[PDB]
Symmetry: C2
Subunit: 257 residues, 2 copies
Amino acid sequence: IVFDRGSPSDIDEIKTFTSNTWKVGYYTDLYSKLADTGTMDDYVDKVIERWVNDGSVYVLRVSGRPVATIHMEKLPDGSVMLGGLRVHPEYRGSRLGMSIMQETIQFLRGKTERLRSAVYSWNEPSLRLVHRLGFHQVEEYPIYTFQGGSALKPVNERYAGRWRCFFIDWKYMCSDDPDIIHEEYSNNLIVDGSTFVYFDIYEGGIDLFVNDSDDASSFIEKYRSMNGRITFYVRKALANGLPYVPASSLTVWEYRY
Amino acid sequence: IVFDRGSPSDIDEIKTFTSNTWKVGYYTDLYSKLADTGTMDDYVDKVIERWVNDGSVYVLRVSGRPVATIHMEKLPDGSVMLGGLRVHPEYRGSRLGMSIMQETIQFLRGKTERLRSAVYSWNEPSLRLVHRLGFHQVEEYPIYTFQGGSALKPVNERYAGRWRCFFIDWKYMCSDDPDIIHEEYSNNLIVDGSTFVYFDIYEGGIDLFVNDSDDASSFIEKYRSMNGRITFYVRKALANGLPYVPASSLTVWEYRY
Protein backbone atom coordinates (compact mmCIF):
# COMPACT_ATOMS: atom_id res chain seq x y z
CA ILE A 1 0.00 0.00 0.00
CA VAL A 2 1.49 3.17 -1.43
CA PHE A 3 0.50 6.81 -0.61
CA ASP A 4 0.50 8.98 -3.70
CA ARG A 5 -1.12 12.02 -5.23
CA GLY A 6 -4.41 11.37 -7.03
CA SER A 7 -4.44 12.03 -10.77
CA PRO A 8 -7.16 12.55 -13.39
CA SER A 9 -6.62 8.98 -14.55
CA ASP A 10 -7.87 7.93 -11.10
CA ILE A 11 -11.17 9.81 -11.43
CA ASP A 12 -13.31 6.97 -12.76
CA GLU A 13 -12.27 4.80 -9.83
CA ILE A 14 -12.50 7.61 -7.34
CA LYS A 15 -16.08 8.34 -8.40
CA THR A 16 -17.11 4.89 -7.10
CA PHE A 17 -15.65 5.49 -3.62
CA THR A 18 -17.92 6.26 -0.59
CA SER A 19 -17.55 7.92 2.80
CA ASN A 20 -19.22 4.77 4.23
CA THR A 21 -16.28 3.08 5.88
CA TRP A 22 -18.34 1.00 8.30
CA LYS A 23 -18.48 -2.81 8.75
CA VAL A 24 -20.55 -4.38 5.98
CA GLY A 25 -24.02 -5.51 7.21
CA TYR A 26 -26.58 -3.68 9.40
CA TYR A 27 -24.38 -0.79 10.10
CA THR A 28 -23.59 -0.04 6.43
CA ASP A 29 -27.32 0.46 5.89
CA LEU A 30 -27.46 2.60 9.02
CA TYR A 31 -24.55 4.76 7.71
CA SER A 32 -26.50 5.60 4.55
CA LYS A 33 -29.59 6.70 6.43
CA LEU A 34 -27.53 8.84 8.79
CA ALA A 35 -25.56 10.33 5.91
CA ASP A 36 -28.85 11.50 4.33
CA THR A 37 -29.52 13.67 7.40
CA GLY A 38 -26.65 15.95 6.29
CA THR A 39 -25.16 17.37 3.13
CA MET A 40 -21.44 16.90 3.40
CA ASP A 41 -21.63 13.87 1.07
CA ASP A 42 -23.42 15.83 -1.60
CA TYR A 43 -20.88 18.63 -1.26
CA VAL A 44 -17.88 16.33 -1.69
CA ASP A 45 -19.67 14.54 -4.57
CA LYS A 46 -19.91 17.91 -6.28
CA VAL A 47 -16.29 19.09 -5.91
CA ILE A 48 -14.13 15.93 -5.68
CA GLU A 49 -13.39 15.83 -9.45
CA ARG A 50 -12.20 19.46 -9.26
CA TRP A 51 -10.02 18.65 -6.30
CA VAL A 52 -8.40 15.68 -8.04
CA ASN A 53 -7.69 17.89 -11.04
CA ASP A 54 -6.19 20.62 -8.80
CA GLY A 55 -3.80 18.13 -7.19
CA SER A 56 -5.28 18.30 -3.68
CA VAL A 57 -6.38 14.69 -3.59
CA TYR A 58 -4.09 11.95 -2.31
CA VAL A 59 -4.68 8.24 -2.53
CA LEU A 60 -3.71 4.89 -1.20
CA ARG A 61 -2.81 2.60 -4.09
CA VAL A 62 -2.74 -1.15 -4.46
CA SER A 63 -0.72 -2.17 -7.51
CA GLY A 64 -1.22 1.33 -8.93
CA ARG A 65 -4.98 1.20 -8.36
CA PRO A 66 -6.49 3.83 -6.10
CA VAL A 67 -8.41 2.34 -3.12
CA ALA A 68 -8.91 5.41 -0.83
CA THR A 69 -8.87 9.18 -1.02
CA ILE A 70 -8.11 12.05 1.25
CA HIS A 71 -8.43 15.78 0.37
CA MET A 72 -6.04 18.36 1.89
CA GLU A 73 -6.22 22.12 1.67
CA LYS A 74 -3.94 24.71 3.23
CA LEU A 75 -5.95 27.53 4.77
CA PRO A 76 -5.02 31.17 5.22
CA ASP A 77 -4.25 30.78 8.96
CA GLY A 78 -1.62 28.24 7.90
CA SER A 79 -3.60 25.18 9.04
CA VAL A 80 -4.59 22.33 6.73
CA MET A 81 -8.16 21.14 6.40
CA LEU A 82 -8.67 17.51 5.70
CA GLY A 83 -11.65 15.74 4.37
CA GLY A 84 -13.20 13.84 1.56
CA LEU A 85 -12.08 10.55 3.18
CA ARG A 86 -13.48 7.82 0.90
CA VAL A 87 -12.79 4.19 0.22
CA HIS A 88 -13.63 1.80 -2.55
CA PRO A 89 -16.73 -0.12 -1.40
CA GLU A 90 -14.88 -3.48 -1.27
CA TYR A 91 -12.67 -2.07 1.49
CA ARG A 92 -15.32 -0.98 3.96
CA GLY A 93 -14.53 -2.09 7.51
CA SER A 94 -10.84 -2.25 6.70
CA ARG A 95 -8.26 0.00 8.29
CA LEU A 96 -7.79 2.03 5.15
CA GLY A 97 -9.17 5.12 6.86
CA MET A 98 -6.63 4.91 9.62
CA SER A 99 -3.78 4.19 7.19
CA ILE A 100 -4.53 7.09 4.93
CA MET A 101 -4.79 9.41 7.96
CA GLN A 102 -1.48 8.16 9.37
CA GLU A 103 0.20 8.69 5.98
CA THR A 104 -1.40 12.11 5.84
CA ILE A 105 -0.15 13.14 9.35
CA GLN A 106 3.36 12.10 8.40
CA PHE A 107 3.17 13.77 5.00
CA LEU A 108 2.10 17.13 6.58
CA ARG A 109 4.60 17.07 9.46
CA GLY A 110 6.64 20.27 9.18
CA LYS A 111 4.33 21.79 6.57
CA THR A 112 1.81 23.09 9.12
CA GLU A 113 1.28 23.27 12.85
CA ARG A 114 -2.42 22.27 12.66
CA LEU A 115 -4.76 19.86 10.95
CA ARG A 116 -8.53 20.17 11.08
CA SER A 117 -11.40 17.97 10.00
CA ALA A 118 -15.15 17.89 10.15
CA VAL A 119 -16.86 14.78 11.57
CA TYR A 120 -20.61 14.09 12.01
CA SER A 121 -21.65 13.70 15.68
CA TRP A 122 -23.19 10.25 14.83
CA ASN A 123 -20.09 8.94 13.02
CA GLU A 124 -18.74 7.07 15.95
CA PRO A 125 -16.05 5.03 14.11
CA SER A 126 -14.66 8.19 12.52
CA LEU A 127 -14.86 10.12 15.84
CA ARG A 128 -12.97 7.25 17.49
CA LEU A 129 -10.38 7.29 14.68
CA VAL A 130 -9.66 11.03 14.96
CA HIS A 131 -9.58 10.82 18.75
CA ARG A 132 -7.23 7.85 18.71
CA LEU A 133 -4.97 9.73 16.30
CA GLY A 134 -4.72 12.64 18.73
CA PHE A 135 -7.23 15.14 17.44
CA HIS A 136 -9.49 16.97 19.91
CA GLN A 137 -12.90 18.52 19.26
CA VAL A 138 -12.73 22.32 19.05
CA GLU A 139 -16.15 23.27 17.73
CA GLU A 140 -19.61 21.98 16.87
CA TYR A 141 -22.41 23.00 14.45
CA PRO A 142 -25.83 21.50 15.16
CA ILE A 143 -27.72 20.75 11.92
CA TYR A 144 -31.26 21.97 11.07
CA THR A 145 -32.88 20.75 7.91
CA PHE A 146 -35.90 22.39 6.36
CA GLN A 147 -38.17 21.65 3.51
CA GLY A 148 -38.06 24.90 1.68
CA GLY A 149 -41.25 25.74 -0.17
CA SER A 150 -41.42 29.34 -1.50
CA ALA A 151 -33.19 36.09 -3.27
CA LEU A 152 -30.10 34.99 -1.38
CA LYS A 153 -27.54 37.64 -2.07
CA PRO A 154 -24.25 38.45 -0.35
CA VAL A 155 -23.94 41.23 2.22
CA ASN A 156 -20.58 42.86 2.42
CA GLU A 157 -20.25 44.90 5.58
CA ARG A 158 -18.02 44.89 8.65
CA TYR A 159 -18.00 42.09 11.20
CA ALA A 160 -18.39 43.57 14.66
CA GLY A 161 -18.79 40.12 16.14
CA ARG A 162 -16.50 38.24 18.44
CA TRP A 163 -15.72 35.03 16.66
CA ARG A 164 -12.44 34.67 14.76
CA CYS A 165 -12.73 31.10 13.51
CA PHE A 166 -15.39 30.27 11.00
CA PHE A 167 -16.71 27.61 8.68
CA ILE A 168 -16.21 28.84 5.19
CA ASP A 169 -16.72 26.59 2.16
CA TRP A 170 -16.43 23.52 4.43
CA LYS A 171 -13.14 24.68 5.88
CA TYR A 172 -12.81 25.82 9.50
CA MET A 173 -10.38 28.73 9.42
CA CYS A 174 -9.27 31.58 11.61
CA SER A 175 -8.15 35.10 10.92
CA ASP A 176 -7.37 37.93 13.44
CA ASP A 177 -8.70 40.25 10.92
CA PRO A 178 -11.87 38.60 9.45
CA ASP A 179 -11.64 41.29 6.70
CA ILE A 180 -9.23 39.02 4.80
CA ILE A 181 -11.37 35.88 4.98
CA HIS A 182 -14.21 38.23 4.09
CA GLU A 183 -12.89 39.77 0.87
CA GLU A 184 -12.03 36.24 -0.30
CA TYR A 185 -15.46 34.52 -0.25
CA SER A 186 -17.37 37.75 -0.62
CA ASN A 187 -20.03 36.44 -3.06
CA ASN A 188 -20.92 33.72 -0.58
CA LEU A 189 -21.02 35.76 2.62
CA ILE A 190 -23.67 37.63 4.53
CA VAL A 191 -21.67 39.74 6.96
CA ASP A 192 -23.06 42.63 8.90
CA GLY A 193 -22.49 43.44 12.55
CA SER A 194 -22.81 40.14 14.43
CA THR A 195 -24.17 38.29 11.42
CA PHE A 196 -21.60 36.11 9.73
CA VAL A 197 -23.09 33.51 7.40
CA TYR A 198 -21.50 31.48 4.67
CA PHE A 199 -23.89 30.14 2.02
CA ASP A 200 -23.65 27.66 -0.86
CA ILE A 201 -26.51 27.46 -3.32
CA TYR A 202 -26.51 24.20 -5.26
CA GLU A 203 -28.71 22.18 -7.57
CA GLY A 204 -31.62 21.16 -5.38
CA GLY A 205 -30.93 23.27 -2.29
CA ILE A 206 -28.82 25.59 -0.17
CA ASP A 207 -26.50 25.14 2.74
CA LEU A 208 -25.98 27.96 5.25
CA PHE A 209 -23.30 27.99 7.89
CA VAL A 210 -24.26 30.33 10.70
CA ASN A 211 -20.99 31.38 12.27
CA ASP A 212 -22.50 34.30 14.19
CA SER A 213 -25.78 36.11 14.61
CA ASP A 214 -27.41 38.43 17.13
CA ASP A 215 -30.65 36.55 16.42
CA ALA A 216 -30.24 33.12 14.82
CA SER A 217 -33.92 32.20 15.29
CA SER A 218 -35.00 35.11 13.07
CA PHE A 219 -32.31 34.39 10.54
CA ILE A 220 -33.50 30.80 10.21
CA GLU A 221 -37.18 31.69 10.19
CA LYS A 222 -36.59 34.10 7.29
CA TYR A 223 -34.50 31.88 5.03
CA ARG A 224 -35.83 28.39 5.81
CA SER A 225 -38.53 29.02 3.21
CA MET A 226 -36.25 29.07 0.28
CA ASN A 227 -36.68 26.46 -2.37
CA GLY A 228 -35.44 22.89 -2.09
CA ARG A 229 -33.45 21.42 0.70
CA ILE A 230 -32.43 24.19 3.14
CA THR A 231 -29.85 23.20 5.75
CA PHE A 232 -28.40 25.34 8.49
CA TYR A 233 -25.21 24.43 10.24
CA VAL A 234 -25.34 26.61 13.33
CA ARG A 235 -22.51 27.27 15.72
CA LYS A 236 -23.25 25.48 19.03
CA ALA A 237 -23.24 28.63 21.18
CA LEU A 238 -26.00 30.07 19.01
CA ALA A 239 -27.92 26.79 18.61
CA ASN A 240 -28.46 26.83 22.30
CA GLY A 241 -30.96 29.66 21.86
CA LEU A 242 -33.02 27.99 19.11
CA PRO A 243 -36.37 26.18 19.81
CA TYR A 244 -35.65 23.08 17.76
CA VAL A 245 -33.36 20.50 19.24
CA PRO A 246 -31.23 18.91 16.49
CA ALA A 247 -30.54 15.21 16.39
CA SER A 248 -27.09 15.75 15.10
CA SER A 249 -24.19 18.06 14.49
CA LEU A 250 -21.13 18.75 12.38
CA THR A 251 -18.15 18.65 14.68
CA VAL A 252 -14.68 20.14 14.20
CA TRP A 253 -11.54 18.32 15.30
CA GLU A 254 -8.00 19.62 15.47
CA TYR A 255 -4.58 17.99 15.55
CA ARG A 256 -1.44 19.88 16.67
CA TYR A 257 2.12 18.94 15.77
CA ILE B 1 -32.89 -20.64 28.46
CA VAL B 2 -36.42 -20.64 29.83
CA PHE B 3 -39.30 -18.25 28.91
CA ASP B 4 -41.32 -17.27 31.94
CA ARG B 5 -43.44 -14.50 33.37
CA GLY B 6 -41.51 -11.73 35.13
CA SER B 7 -42.16 -11.34 38.86
CA PRO B 8 -41.54 -8.59 41.42
CA SER B 9 -38.54 -10.53 42.68
CA ASP B 10 -37.00 -9.92 39.23
CA ILE B 11 -37.35 -6.13 39.46
CA ASP B 12 -33.90 -5.33 40.83
CA GLU B 13 -32.31 -7.25 37.97
CA ILE B 14 -34.73 -5.94 35.41
CA LYS B 15 -33.92 -2.35 36.40
CA THR B 16 -30.33 -2.88 35.16
CA PHE B 17 -31.44 -4.04 31.69
CA THR B 18 -31.15 -1.73 28.61
CA SER B 19 -32.75 -1.45 25.18
CA ASN B 20 -29.17 -1.29 23.81
CA THR B 21 -28.83 -4.70 22.24
CA TRP B 22 -26.04 -3.75 19.85
CA LYS B 23 -22.51 -5.22 19.49
CA VAL B 24 -20.27 -3.92 22.26
CA GLY B 25 -17.78 -1.27 21.00
CA TYR B 26 -18.34 1.78 18.73
CA TYR B 27 -21.88 0.95 17.99
CA THR B 28 -22.94 0.64 21.66
CA ASP B 29 -21.86 4.26 22.13
CA LEU B 30 -23.69 5.19 18.94
CA TYR B 31 -26.90 3.47 20.25
CA SER B 32 -26.89 5.67 23.36
CA LYS B 33 -26.58 8.89 21.40
CA LEU B 34 -29.35 7.85 19.02
CA ALA B 35 -31.57 6.75 21.89
CA ASP B 36 -31.29 10.27 23.39
CA THR B 37 -32.93 11.70 20.26
CA GLY B 38 -36.21 10.07 21.36
CA THR B 39 -38.18 9.38 24.51
CA MET B 40 -39.29 5.79 24.31
CA ASP B 41 -36.50 4.76 26.71
CA ASP B 42 -37.57 7.27 29.30
CA TYR B 43 -41.17 6.11 28.93
CA VAL B 44 -40.33 2.45 29.47
CA ASP B 45 -38.01 3.40 32.36
CA LYS B 46 -40.99 5.06 33.98
CA VAL B 47 -43.57 2.25 33.64
CA ILE B 48 -41.60 -1.04 33.52
CA GLU B 49 -41.87 -1.66 37.30
CA ARG B 50 -45.66 -1.23 37.05
CA TRP B 51 -45.78 -3.63 34.14
CA VAL B 52 -43.78 -6.29 35.98
CA ASN B 53 -46.13 -5.95 38.93
CA ASP B 54 -49.21 -6.23 36.65
CA GLY B 55 -47.92 -9.48 35.14
CA SER B 56 -47.40 -8.15 31.60
CA VAL B 57 -43.66 -8.64 31.58
CA TYR B 58 -42.10 -11.90 30.41
CA VAL B 59 -38.48 -12.89 30.70
CA LEU B 60 -35.82 -15.20 29.48
CA ARG B 61 -34.15 -16.90 32.43
CA VAL B 62 -30.78 -18.51 32.90
CA SER B 63 -30.74 -20.70 36.00
CA GLY B 64 -33.73 -18.76 37.33
CA ARG B 65 -32.04 -15.41 36.71
CA PRO B 66 -33.77 -13.00 34.36
CA VAL B 67 -31.58 -11.94 31.38
CA ALA B 68 -34.12 -10.27 29.01
CA THR B 69 -37.57 -8.73 29.11
CA ILE B 70 -40.46 -8.29 26.79
CA HIS B 71 -43.73 -6.43 27.56
CA MET B 72 -47.05 -7.57 26.02
CA GLU B 73 -50.39 -5.84 26.15
CA LYS B 74 -53.67 -6.87 24.56
CA LEU B 75 -55.37 -3.91 22.92
CA PRO B 76 -59.07 -3.25 22.39
CA ASP B 77 -58.97 -4.21 18.68
CA GLY B 78 -57.77 -7.63 19.84
CA SER B 79 -54.15 -7.13 18.75
CA VAL B 80 -51.18 -7.36 21.11
CA MET B 81 -48.62 -4.60 21.41
CA LEU B 82 -45.12 -5.62 22.19
CA GLY B 83 -42.29 -3.62 23.52
CA GLY B 84 -39.97 -2.92 26.35
CA LEU B 85 -37.41 -5.35 24.83
CA ARG B 86 -34.38 -5.15 27.15
CA VAL B 87 -31.38 -7.27 27.93
CA HIS B 88 -28.90 -7.43 30.75
CA PRO B 89 -25.85 -5.45 29.59
CA GLU B 90 -23.56 -8.52 29.57
CA TYR B 91 -25.71 -10.01 26.82
CA ARG B 92 -25.57 -7.21 24.28
CA GLY B 93 -24.83 -8.48 20.77
CA SER B 94 -26.23 -11.88 21.64
CA ARG B 95 -29.33 -13.33 20.04
CA LEU B 96 -31.42 -12.84 23.14
CA GLY B 97 -33.63 -10.34 21.32
CA MET B 98 -34.45 -12.80 18.62
CA SER B 99 -35.02 -15.63 21.10
CA ILE B 100 -37.38 -13.70 23.28
CA MET B 101 -39.33 -12.57 20.19
CA GLN B 102 -39.55 -16.14 18.87
CA GLU B 103 -40.78 -17.36 22.27
CA THR B 104 -43.23 -14.48 22.30
CA ILE B 105 -44.63 -15.28 18.79
CA GLN B 106 -45.16 -18.88 19.82
CA PHE B 107 -46.65 -17.92 23.17
CA LEU B 108 -49.24 -15.60 21.49
CA ARG B 109 -50.17 -17.96 18.66
CA GLY B 110 -53.94 -18.48 18.88
CA LYS B 111 -54.41 -15.69 21.42
CA THR B 112 -54.49 -12.92 18.81
CA GLU B 113 -54.39 -12.46 15.06
CA ARG B 114 -51.94 -9.50 15.21
CA LEU B 115 -48.80 -8.33 16.95
CA ARG B 116 -47.51 -4.78 16.76
CA SER B 117 -44.33 -3.06 17.84
CA ALA B 118 -42.70 0.31 17.64
CA VAL B 119 -39.14 0.55 16.27
CA TYR B 120 -36.95 3.66 15.78
CA SER B 121 -36.10 4.35 12.11
CA TRP B 122 -32.33 4.34 13.02
CA ASN B 123 -32.46 1.03 14.91
CA GLU B 124 -31.28 -1.06 12.05
CA PRO B 125 -30.57 -4.30 13.98
CA SER B 126 -34.05 -4.22 15.51
CA LEU B 127 -35.66 -3.31 12.15
CA ARG B 128 -33.81 -6.26 10.59
CA LEU B 129 -34.97 -8.53 13.44
CA VAL B 130 -38.67 -7.64 13.08
CA HIS B 131 -38.45 -7.90 9.30
CA ARG B 132 -36.73 -11.26 9.45
CA LEU B 133 -39.42 -12.48 11.85
CA GLY B 134 -42.13 -11.55 9.35
CA PHE B 135 -43.38 -8.20 10.53
CA HIS B 136 -44.07 -5.44 7.99
CA GLN B 137 -44.06 -1.69 8.54
CA VAL B 138 -47.59 -0.26 8.66
CA GLU B 139 -47.06 3.28 9.90
CA GLU B 140 -44.46 5.91 10.75
CA TYR B 141 -44.26 8.93 13.10
CA PRO B 142 -41.46 11.41 12.37
CA ILE B 143 -40.04 12.89 15.60
CA TYR B 144 -39.70 16.64 16.36
CA THR B 145 -37.97 17.68 19.53
CA PHE B 146 -38.22 21.15 20.99
CA GLN B 147 -36.65 22.98 23.81
CA GLY B 148 -39.69 24.27 25.57
CA GLY B 149 -39.16 27.57 27.35
CA SER B 150 -42.37 29.25 28.58
CA ALA B 151 -51.96 24.61 30.32
CA LEU B 152 -52.21 21.30 28.51
CA LYS B 153 -55.70 20.09 29.17
CA PRO B 154 -57.77 17.39 27.48
CA VAL B 155 -60.39 18.20 24.84
CA ASN B 156 -63.27 15.81 24.66
CA GLU B 157 -65.22 16.29 21.46
CA ARG B 158 -66.08 14.18 18.42
CA TYR B 159 -63.51 12.94 15.94
CA ALA B 160 -64.63 13.82 12.45
CA GLY B 161 -61.31 12.72 11.04
CA ARG B 162 -60.52 9.80 8.82
CA TRP B 163 -57.95 7.79 10.70
CA ARG B 164 -59.01 4.71 12.66
CA CYS B 165 -55.66 3.53 13.99
CA PHE B 166 -53.85 5.66 16.48
CA PHE B 167 -50.91 5.82 18.84
CA ILE B 168 -52.30 5.96 22.31
CA ASP B 169 -50.09 5.56 25.38
CA TRP B 170 -47.38 3.96 23.19
CA LYS B 171 -49.78 1.42 21.77
CA TYR B 172 -50.89 1.50 18.12
CA MET B 173 -54.55 0.50 18.17
CA CYS B 174 -57.57 0.62 15.94
CA SER B 175 -61.25 1.08 16.55
CA ASP B 176 -64.11 1.49 13.97
CA ASP B 177 -65.70 3.72 16.42
CA PRO B 178 -62.90 5.95 17.88
CA ASP B 179 -65.49 6.93 20.56
CA ILE B 180 -64.46 3.85 22.56
CA ILE B 181 -60.72 4.48 22.42
CA HIS B 182 -61.68 8.06 23.20
CA GLU B 183 -63.68 7.58 26.40
CA GLU B 184 -60.85 5.36 27.67
CA TYR B 185 -57.86 7.76 27.61
CA SER B 186 -60.00 10.85 27.88
CA ASN B 187 -57.75 12.79 30.31
CA ASN B 188 -54.87 12.40 27.88
CA LEU B 189 -56.63 13.26 24.63
CA ILE B 190 -57.20 16.41 22.64
CA VAL B 191 -59.91 15.40 20.19
CA ASP B 192 -61.92 17.82 18.15
CA GLY B 193 -62.85 17.54 14.49
CA SER B 194 -59.68 16.42 12.69
CA THR B 195 -57.48 16.97 15.72
CA PHE B 196 -56.59 13.76 17.50
CA VAL B 197 -53.64 14.09 19.87
CA TYR B 198 -52.50 11.87 22.68
CA PHE B 199 -50.33 13.56 25.32
CA ASP B 200 -48.23 12.37 28.26
CA ILE B 201 -46.89 14.95 30.68
CA TYR B 202 -43.96 13.65 32.70
CA GLU B 203 -41.24 14.86 35.02
CA GLY B 204 -39.07 17.03 32.81
CA GLY B 205 -41.23 17.20 29.69
CA ILE B 206 -44.18 16.20 27.55
CA ASP B 207 -44.69 13.84 24.69
CA LEU B 208 -47.43 14.47 22.11
CA PHE B 209 -48.53 11.98 19.52
CA VAL B 210 -50.22 13.75 16.63
CA ASN B 211 -52.51 11.18 15.09
CA ASP B 212 -54.50 13.72 13.08
CA SER B 213 -54.78 17.45 12.56
CA ASP B 214 -56.17 19.82 9.96
CA ASP B 215 -53.13 22.01 10.66
CA ALA B 216 -50.20 20.25 12.35
CA SER B 217 -47.83 23.20 11.84
CA SER B 218 -50.06 25.45 13.98
CA PHE B 219 -50.56 22.77 16.57
CA ILE B 220 -46.81 22.36 16.97
CA GLU B 221 -46.09 26.08 16.91
CA LYS B 222 -48.57 26.62 19.76
CA TYR B 223 -47.46 23.85 22.10
CA ARG B 224 -43.72 23.59 21.39
CA SER B 225 -43.21 26.38 23.93
CA MET B 226 -44.25 24.39 26.89
CA ASN B 227 -41.74 23.76 29.60
CA GLY B 228 -39.01 21.14 29.43
CA ARG B 229 -38.45 18.66 26.70
CA ILE B 230 -41.35 18.82 24.21
CA THR B 231 -41.48 15.99 21.67
CA PHE B 232 -43.99 15.50 18.90
CA TYR B 233 -44.46 12.18 17.23
CA VAL B 234 -46.35 13.13 14.08
CA ARG B 235 -48.08 10.78 11.72
CA LYS B 236 -46.10 10.62 8.44
CA ALA B 237 -48.93 11.87 6.22
CA LEU B 238 -49.13 15.02 8.30
CA ALA B 239 -45.36 15.42 8.76
CA ASN B 240 -45.10 15.84 5.06
CA GLY B 241 -46.65 19.30 5.40
CA LEU B 242 -44.31 20.55 8.15
CA PRO B 243 -41.26 22.82 7.44
CA TYR B 244 -38.78 20.93 9.58
CA VAL B 245 -37.36 17.74 8.20
CA PRO B 246 -36.84 15.21 11.01
CA ALA B 247 -33.77 13.05 11.22
CA SER B 248 -35.72 10.16 12.55
CA SER B 249 -39.03 8.50 13.14
CA LEU B 250 -40.96 6.05 15.28
CA THR B 251 -42.08 3.25 13.04
CA VAL B 252 -44.88 0.73 13.54
CA TRP B 253 -44.51 -2.92 12.54
CA GLU B 254 -47.17 -5.60 12.38
CA TYR B 255 -47.10 -9.38 12.40
CA ARG B 256 -50.11 -11.48 11.28
CA TYR B 257 -50.75 -15.08 12.27
